[PDB]
Design a protein around this ligand. Structure first.
Ligand SMILES: NC(=O)c1cn([C@@H]2O[C@H](CO)[C@@H](O)[C@H]2O)c2ncnc(N)c12
Ligand SMILES: CC1=C(/C=C/C(C)=C/C=C/C(C)=C/C=O)C(C)(C)CCC1
Lengths: 215, 223, 346, 324
């Protein structure tokens, strides 16, 4: 079968940098590599086709080199729209699928920032439905080398917590994460200490913010 | 340029069937191969199927092979994807793409794509949101800033919009992407960090609109 | 005139046939003047069977110093045969030419048939052309399986038999390689049936034969090559520039399958050219052009051709303008030349 | 007699002016008029003016077109040379002499001029025979299936020369003699004098048989076979317009080829035979120029038939005429 790998998996770059990414196929599919850029609110768009030949109507900032099983895509100077996922493709069959990489995320390099940790009580209205949802906000941190953990009565809650992470902001260019721990009303009323423990590299050791039921 | 405009999306039951149409222009259909590619939301691209330029040979990715049947009419200049058997993983934006020649022909690559057409595989009727306040804590007062929010729970289908104070407060407002729950209903929380000191001096109201039922619920979140 | 009398005598001979030296072959009209001499029809004294005699005139040989080219074509064609490569039957000399007398193909050459169908009809009808393409491909394939770089192939070397089956014929300037080499330098073959690699004086593999196929196929259908106009051939220098630089445009005479197939063969870089893709030449065989023709039946010659050459008419030109090149003035044969002439003959 | 016999002349006119002697020193005007000499000279002028370009071209075109240099054309080049022998040996001399009204180069001159004219005409005669042979050889096969090669061509050329010498050389050694013919300004063969001293009778039989009848027979055989072959070929191949056309054309051509040999040598043979069979056959001097007219014109018409009506030469000639 055909396995597409890329490296770096993710890389931190700034505008006007020389970014070099590589792609590797598990078997020889000959000189046959296209490079695509994908970024939200767009459909996939061709950059390089054939083996290293620049596609028509594509900036000459993108270029490719090499051959064999190891292909290269180089961006000579970055622009603020080159923070995106880049996919290689090999476009051949024997009747095997046309195989794409797992994307290489070029992200915006910046300073570390600690998260502001807030833990939120459910209201009376929330408890009336029959579910209790306890919300933890980790606001304005960088990078995504952070783990949220929920403890209720010191017991680790996993497999009943859901995380959602926003990408880079336009207000300060950081990440925010909201994790919503969903419990039964019954479990909530058999519990007392609800604690959100936040692990981050900007923090010396995990910061726990907790509350006792209601205000 | 060459352009593809898809149509024929919609909501469809699991294990049902749907036919997508991709209307092609800027080229003669009989002179170009046509393929389907799909994208699961916020993920990679999976190729689905191809059918030859003058139409006769077909190839398929194994996961969709047989289940989906690619076809085309060169008398309409339109490619179709007949999708039989729908599954949870089939919930995706579906793209048609173009391809030129076949078996080495200036060593092509997939050069024109559609804008996608949304296929939603799900079972449930439209449902307005229940909006619960997420009360601030008196133990988050320790930094001088409290975060409070609203949990907009058990709605179907997307999208909801959540704003604060009728859109007047939108900075520091983090409205997270919808997560699909195991109830088959979407849920999101929208939170805002405010000064703890301004609680009970300023009221914070989440304005929740759910367009696919036109249901609007405004919930004042307690100081 | 006298040529018509000779043509009438040919018709007479054919009738007898249907129903080694100067005292062993009845001579008829020349059919063209090749690279090194004329190629005339002829007939066996004791068999009453028609053969072509590719004459390489001694005078013209001395002028062009074409002694190397003669030996290569002989030895190669003599050794390699299939059902898409015709047999060589005799190699003798007379007194004025070296002779290759080769086996029957009384159906004329493909180049003739482009114009004899009608000259207002360019090439053959699509099914008929497709059939012949499939057969030419099989012949090339047989060479490639034996690790032979041909460096040639042309319409005039694709002969029709009276059945209507086509075969490549006359294996000219070529090299038969062993297993353990595929790359060889040189400048060889007739210009226009040579790929970029040869012309630039670089190494080349099996790819080049597939370049020649592209030129052949294109000329077969459109009645003109990609690098020459209808019933024309340009000078070697210009032809070299054409092969390297000229992009191929495709008439609507071609079907879509045939257009795509021609494009695949006529790429200037070997890497982008269909043929040997570094593990098979059977990737070529997968092209939709050949969905019409089953490979198993084709290779065994079990498929009926959609045209059968009539035997009540005779194919190939009768002299009325054929090429020419110098015959000797003061120029007197070397001892070496005489030794070559005996050596050539079997 | 049958004219006026001499041991070194044969005035065809009968003696009745009392001055009919040798015309090597006697000006002929007692059996001719000045205007007839002008017409004689005019006719010789014509034969030079046409004959030399036509025959020169035949040699010339082959040298500049590679493809023409082939064994089967050797004999045709030879024909052109033969014709030129007649032009410069016979025609030019006769033009010169005619304006004096008699042959002014004397007995030795007569033998020379008569030799070159005969030599020329005989190489031509035998060329036409060899050509018919070669055509028979190529199509009809002498030995089943044969290639016509260089050696045979050379032999063919040599053969015409040898046969011509076999005819032209005897009157120089006294078996027959050259003596003035016509208006006495050209020298022909003594066949018209019953003169014992040169043994004319045996010579006339030899001439008639070996140099007319034999050729005539050979020509009839060869072309008869050839026309038969082509008729047969066409019959076995009803399909195609070309074969039917070919049959008609070949029959037409063969009639032209036979007729051209007849016109050239039949007058000499006919006249010679008549005089031999019947004694006292007086033919005038003007009348004796008639066989020469017919024979001499073959220096033009032989190359028309045997060169121009051959496809290869035609193409080359067209090339040269359209700049070359
Ligand atoms: N060399 C060959 O094998 C042959 C070439 N010709 C004709 O000879 C012409 C001059 O090469 C070609 O265009 C054909 O018409 C042939 N015609 C019949 N049989 C053949 N074996 C050949
Ligand atoms: C006498 C004679 C013959 C030949 C005559 C010749 C050869 C005449 C040439 C005349 C010229 C060249 C005039 C100018 C024939 C035909 C053998 C038949 C027998 C009689």
């Amino acid at each position: 079968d055909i396995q597409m790998t890329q490296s770096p998996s993710s890389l931190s770059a700034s505008v006007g940098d020389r970014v070099t990414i590589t792609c590797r196929a598990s078997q020889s599919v000959s000189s046959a590599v296209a490079w695509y850029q994908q970024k939200p609110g767009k459909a996939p768009k061709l950059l390089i086709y054939s083996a290293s030949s620049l596609y028509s109507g594509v900036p000459s900032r993108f270029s490719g080199s090499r051959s064999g099983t190891d292909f290269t895509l180089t961006i000579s100077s970055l622009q603020p729209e080159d923070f995106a996922t880049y996919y290689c493709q090999q476009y051949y069959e024997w009747l095997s699928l046309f195989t794409f990489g797992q994307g290489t995320k070029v992200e915006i390099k910046r300073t570390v920032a600690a998260p502001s940790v807030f833990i939120f009580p459910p209201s009376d209205s929330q408890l009336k439905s029959g579910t209790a949802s306890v919300v933890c906000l980790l606001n304005n941190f960088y990078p995504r080398e952070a783990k949220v953990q929920w403890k209720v009565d010191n017991a680790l809650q996993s497999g009943n917590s859901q995380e959602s992470v926003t990408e880079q902001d336009s207000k300060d260019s950081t990440y925010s994460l909201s994790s919503t721990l969903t419990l039964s009303k019954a479990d909530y009323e058999k519990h007392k200490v609800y604690a959100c423990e936040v692990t981050h590299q900007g923090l010396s050791s995990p910061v726990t913010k907790s509350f006792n039921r209601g205000e | 340029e060459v352009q593809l405009v898809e149509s024929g999306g919609g909501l469809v039951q699991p294990g049902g069937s749907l036919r997508l149409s991709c209307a092609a222009s800027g080229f003669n259909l009989y002179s170009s191969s046509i393929h389907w590619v799909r994208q699961a939301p916020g993920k990679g691209l999976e190729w689905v199927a191809s059918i030859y330029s003058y139409y006769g040979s077909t190839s398929y990715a194994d996961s969709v092979k047989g289940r989906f049947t690619i076809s085309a009419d060169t008398s309409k200049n339109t490619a179709y994807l007949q999708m039989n058997s729908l599954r949870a993983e089939d919930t995706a934006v579906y793209y048609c793409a173009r391809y030129e020649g076949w078996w080495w022909a200036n060593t092509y690559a997939l050069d024109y794509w559609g804008q996608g057409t949304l296929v939603t595989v799900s079972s449930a009727s439209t449902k307005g949101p229940s909006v619960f306040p997420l009360a601030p804590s008196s133990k988050s007062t320790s930094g001088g800033t409290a975060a409070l929010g609203c949990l907009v729970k058990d709605y179907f289908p997307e999208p909801v919009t959540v704003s604060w104070n009728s859109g007047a407060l939108t900075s520091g407002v983090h409205t997270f992407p919808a997560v699909l729950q195991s109830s088959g209903l979407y849920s999101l929380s929208s939170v805002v960090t405010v000064p703890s000191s301004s609680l009970g001096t300023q009221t914070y109201i989440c304005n929740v609109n759910h367009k696919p039922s036109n249901t609007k619920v405004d919930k004042k979140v307690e100081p | 005139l006298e040529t018509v009398v000779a043509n009438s005598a040919f018709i007479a001979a054919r009738g007898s046939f249907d129903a080694m030296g100067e005292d062993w072959f009845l001579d008829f009209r020349v059919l063209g003047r090749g690279g090194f001499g004329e190629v005339f029809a002829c007939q066996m004294k004791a068999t009453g069977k028609l053969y072509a005699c590719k004459k390489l005139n001694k005078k013209r040989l001395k002028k062009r110093k074409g002694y190397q080219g003669a030996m290569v074509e002989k030895k190669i064609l003599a050794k390699v045969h299939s059902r898409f490569i015709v047999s060589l039957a005799y190699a003798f000399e007379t007194k004025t030419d070296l002779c290759l007398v080769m086996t029957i193909m009384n159906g004329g050459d493909i180049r003739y048939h482009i114009y004899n169908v009608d000259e207002d009809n360019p090439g053959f009808q699509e099914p008929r052309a497709i059939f012949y393409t499939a057969q030419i491909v099989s012949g090339l394939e047989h060479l490639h399986q034996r690790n032979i770089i041909y460096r040639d192939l042309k319409p005039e070397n694709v002969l029709l038999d009276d059945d209507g089956n086509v075969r490549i014929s006359d294996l000219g300037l070529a090299v038969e390689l062993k297993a353990g080499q595929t790359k060889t330098k040189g400048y060889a073959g007739t210009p226009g049936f040579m790929a970029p690699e040869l012309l630039l004086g670089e190494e080349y593999d099996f790819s080049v034969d597939y370049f020649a196929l592209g030129v052949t196929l294109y000329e077969m259908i459109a009645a003109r090559g990609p690098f020459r106009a209808r019933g024309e051939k340009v000078e070697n220098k210009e032809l070299k520039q054409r092969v390297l630089e000229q992009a191929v445009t495709y008439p609507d005479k071609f079907s879509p399958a045939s257009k795509d197939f021609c494009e695949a063969l006529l790429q200037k870089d070997p890497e982008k050219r269909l043929g040997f893709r570094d593990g098979s030449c059977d990737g070529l065989r997968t092209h939709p052009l050949f969905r019409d023709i089953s490979w198993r039946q084709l290779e065994a010659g079990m498929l009926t051709p959609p045209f059968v050459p009539d035997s009540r008419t005779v194919y190939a030109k009768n002299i009325q303008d054929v090429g020419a090149f110098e015959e000797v003035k003061g120029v007197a044969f070397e001892k070496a030349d005489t030794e070559f002439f005996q050596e050539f003959a079997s | 007699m049958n004219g006026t016999e001499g041991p070194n002349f044969y005035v065809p006119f009968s003696n009745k002016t009392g001055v009919v002697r040798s015309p090597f020193e006697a000006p002929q005007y007692y059996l001719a008029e000045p205007w007839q000499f002008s017409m004689l000279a005019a006719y010789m002028f014509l034969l030079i003016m046409l004959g030399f370009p036509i025959n020169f071209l035949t040699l010339y075109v082959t040298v500049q077109h590679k493809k023409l240099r082939t064994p089967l054309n050797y004999i045709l080049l030879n024909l052109a040379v033969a014709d030129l022998f007649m032009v410069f040996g016979g025609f030019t001399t006769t033009l010169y002499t005619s304006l004096h009204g008699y042959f002014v180069f004397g007995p030795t001159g007569c033998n020379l001029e008569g030799f070159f004219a005969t030599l020329g005409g005989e190489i031509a005669l035998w060329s036409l025979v060899v050509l018919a042979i070669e055509r028979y050889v190529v199509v009809c096969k002498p030995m089943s299936n044969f290639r016509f090669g260089e050696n045979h061509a050379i032999m063919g050329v040599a053969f015409t020369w040898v046969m011509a010498l076999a005819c032209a050389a005897p009157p120089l050694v006294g078996w027959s003699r050259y003596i003035p013919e016509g208006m006495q300004c050209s020298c022909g063969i003594d066949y018209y004098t019953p003169h014992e001293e040169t043994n004319n009778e045996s010579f006339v039989i030899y001439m008639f048989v070996v140099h007319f009848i034999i050729p005539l027979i050979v020509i009839f055989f060869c072309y008869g076979q050839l026309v038969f072959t082509v008729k047969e070929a066409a019959a076995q191949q009803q399909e195609s317009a070309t074969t039917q056309k070919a049959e008609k054309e070949v029959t037409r051509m063969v009639i032209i080829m036979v007729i051209a040999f007849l016109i050239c040598w039949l007058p000499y043979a006919g006249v010679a035979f008549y005089i031999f069979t019947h004694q006292g056959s007086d033919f005038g001097p003007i009348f004796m120029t008639i066989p020469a007219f017919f024979a001499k014109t073959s220096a033009v018409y032989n190359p028309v038939i045997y060169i121009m009506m051959n496809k290869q030469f035609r193409n080359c000639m067209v090339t040269t005429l359209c700049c070359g």
